[PDB]
Design a protein around this ligand. Sequence first.
Ligand SMILES: NC(=O)C1=CN([C@@H]2O[C@H](COP(=O)(O)OP(=O)(O)OC[C@H]3O[C@@H](n4cnc5c(N)ncnc54)[C@H](OP(=O)(O)O)[C@@H]3O)[C@@H](O)[C@H]2O)C=CC1
Ligand SMILES: NC(=O)C1=CN([C@@H]2O[C@H](COP(=O)(O)OP(=O)(O)OC[C@H]3O[C@@H](n4cnc5c(N)ncnc54)[C@H](OP(=O)(O)O)[C@@H]3O)[C@@H](O)[C@H]2O)C=CC1
Ligand SMILES: COc1cc([C@@H]2OC[C@@H]3[C@H]2CO[C@H]3c2ccc(O)c(OC)c2)ccc1O
Ligand SMILES: COc1cc([C@@H]2OC[C@@H]3[C@H]2CO[C@H]3c2ccc(O)c(OC)c2)ccc1O
Lengths: 285, 285
Amino acid sequence: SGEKTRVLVVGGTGTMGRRIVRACLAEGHETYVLQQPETRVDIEKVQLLYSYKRLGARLIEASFSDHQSLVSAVKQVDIVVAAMSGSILVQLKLVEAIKEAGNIKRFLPSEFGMDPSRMDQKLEVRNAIEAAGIPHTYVVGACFAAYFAGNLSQMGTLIPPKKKVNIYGDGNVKVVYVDEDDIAEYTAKTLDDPRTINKTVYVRPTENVLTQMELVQIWEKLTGKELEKTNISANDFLQAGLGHFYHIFYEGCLTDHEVGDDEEASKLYPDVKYTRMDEYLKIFL
Amino acid sequence: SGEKTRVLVVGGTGTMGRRIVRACLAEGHETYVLQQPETRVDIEKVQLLYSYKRLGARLIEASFSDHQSLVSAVKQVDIVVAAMSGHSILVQLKLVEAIKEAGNIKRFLPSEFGMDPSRDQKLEVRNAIEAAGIPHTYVVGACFAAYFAGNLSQMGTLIPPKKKVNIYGDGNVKVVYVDEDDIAEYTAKTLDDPRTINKTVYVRPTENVLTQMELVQIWEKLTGKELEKTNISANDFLQAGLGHFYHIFYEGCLTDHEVGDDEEASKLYPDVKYTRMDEYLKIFL
Ligand SMILES: NC(=O)C1=CN([C@@H]2O[C@H](COP(=O)(O)OP(=O)(O)OC[C@H]3O[C@@H](n4cnc5c(N)ncnc54)[C@H](OP(=O)(O)O)[C@@H]3O)[C@@H](O)[C@H]2O)C=CC1
Ligand SMILES: NC(=O)C1=CN([C@@H]2O[C@H](COP(=O)(O)OP(=O)(O)OC[C@H]3O[C@@H](n4cnc5c(N)ncnc54)[C@H](OP(=O)(O)O)[C@@H]3O)[C@@H](O)[C@H]2O)C=CC1
Ligand SMILES: COc1cc([C@@H]2OC[C@@H]3[C@H]2CO[C@H]3c2ccc(O)c(OC)c2)ccc1O
Ligand SMILES: COc1cc([C@@H]2OC[C@@H]3[C@H]2CO[C@H]3c2ccc(O)c(OC)c2)ccc1O
């Protein structure tokens, strides 16, 4: 009990933040969630925060505009994980508090997407972490399955289309589709792993490196219906999100480099039986 | 299984609606959830909807602007429960027209779950329900605990204040504070109860009939801290939100008429061990 790693989760009601909270709990960490002052009446956010208490988490009230409150929060833990909307730069206030507190064994900033160093506020946050001497882990390299797999990678929707589907280019560019729950579980496992201190950890589970046509074909196999496919050229492709989609599906930024086993989450943590996309898609049938 | 009541929940990703979905499942009803077209990318809404399928619910796609899709949906069930946001209410007039044409529905519980509007959009929905001869149950008479108890009935916040509290009048007007989960469980139990056909069901669990001062004193006993109290007179209090608090806390509209055992949820369903407010408030300590 006294040898549990203590983790503060910042952004604990976010999409990835809420999963990190539960993953830290499931991993046995003594888990604390930053409780920011209310900005409005927001019942869903409040009930989510207090539901963590029933699971055994603690809430720590603090405000990013009150440096003392951040220092006091981080003094109660060994590791900080942030998962802010991308409010990336608000983490600079967090870095300053960590630097002053002095007790933090590791900081995991709000990454969980493309590696920005291969492409940013995130790099600005990385530079402050490193300048301060705060030990770090950067979790990168996967598309959230909810945002790119459940919709067969169509923009503007989160569910599989009924008959028509746009194919980017020839849909033969490899993409990394990972269940958000698995990203959170890999994060909970890696944050006190001595092997990943001051490392970038790539989330690239081998069987989930799929081209978009491969993903569409997983779905066509589950439904028994071929979809009507329209290919979109890079020029015709060139609104929120275009030019994330471009880098991913045309440039293949998630798969244009190899990753060693010592830096890849599914090899670092082989007991995590990550969700393959055929299983992920079954919920939509 | 063939003896299950089939229930369609309209508004199933809302605050009350999500609880009604789960309470209908926990009661053993064969549960359907209206799936409206996406109006945006909404990760939380989509994932809540599909999470119901893992619990055994089914999704029926329909749209309020497509009359025939609503007719198709309600023909698949026996009972419809609506819990739309408090325009939104008037959308139910479409639903009534679809239920009237479909002809198969045994009961419709419209979106009530608060002040009795017989004493306006809710009343207009009631009139259309009754004109169409659709059997109904109106579930009324309680303040959601999350909106009125966890904040000690202060406005603008959902958690207990740390030092100061506004008391409305002398704070000796009886209010009804009920955990939303209990409201949803009463709703699931009453929707096929022969005793409540064409009736109003008041959710007034006896030990949760409390003045604001009694609620504040419950909190002070749990915390051992006396709060600084400012009494706000009726005249000074004296907008829709303000009008709601005025009717509840100054006019006592939830408790000024007594209710018979045959029309009050806690007496009709005495097996529901409703959360008393001393237990409700403990999650905030
Ligand atoms: N396919 C992929 O790889 C994806 C990658 N990502 C990345 O994941 C990370 C998290 O994004 P996501 O989970 O969608 O985040 P969210 O939109 O869910 O927001 C997460 C948390 O941000 C906090 N927040 C927002 N604004 C502020 C603010 N001004 N001040 C203080 N706190 C604030 C809030 O914390 P609180 O809960 O305390 O209120 C919020 O809950 C991001 O880096 C994102 O780039 C996200 C989507 C897809
Ligand atoms: N203290 C009390 O007694 C309380 C009483 N209430 C009452 O409870 C009932 C539900 O309120 P609440 O739980 O807060 O509702 P919500 O605001 O949580 O929303 C409920 C559902 O409304 C549907 N909706 C909203 N607009 C539309 C629209 N134009 N067209 C179609 N569907 C729409 C959506 O359903 P979908 O899920 O399909 O997307 C939404 O999920 C109301 O009658 C309210 O007056 C509410 C608060 C406190
Ligand atoms: C995969 O790496 C990232 C992903 C994103 C995720 O693409 C930006 C976002 C996002 C997911 O939501 C994607 C998006 C933008 C516009 C859309 O219409 C969309 O539809 C699913 C999805 C954000 C930052 C990243 O580094
Ligand atoms: C019977 O109770 C009702 C409650 C409301 C709930 O009071 C109107 C609303 C609402 C909850 O959110 C309440 C509210 C409005 C403004 C606020 O500042 C507020 O702070 C908690 C709370 C809606 C309709 C009702 O019939």
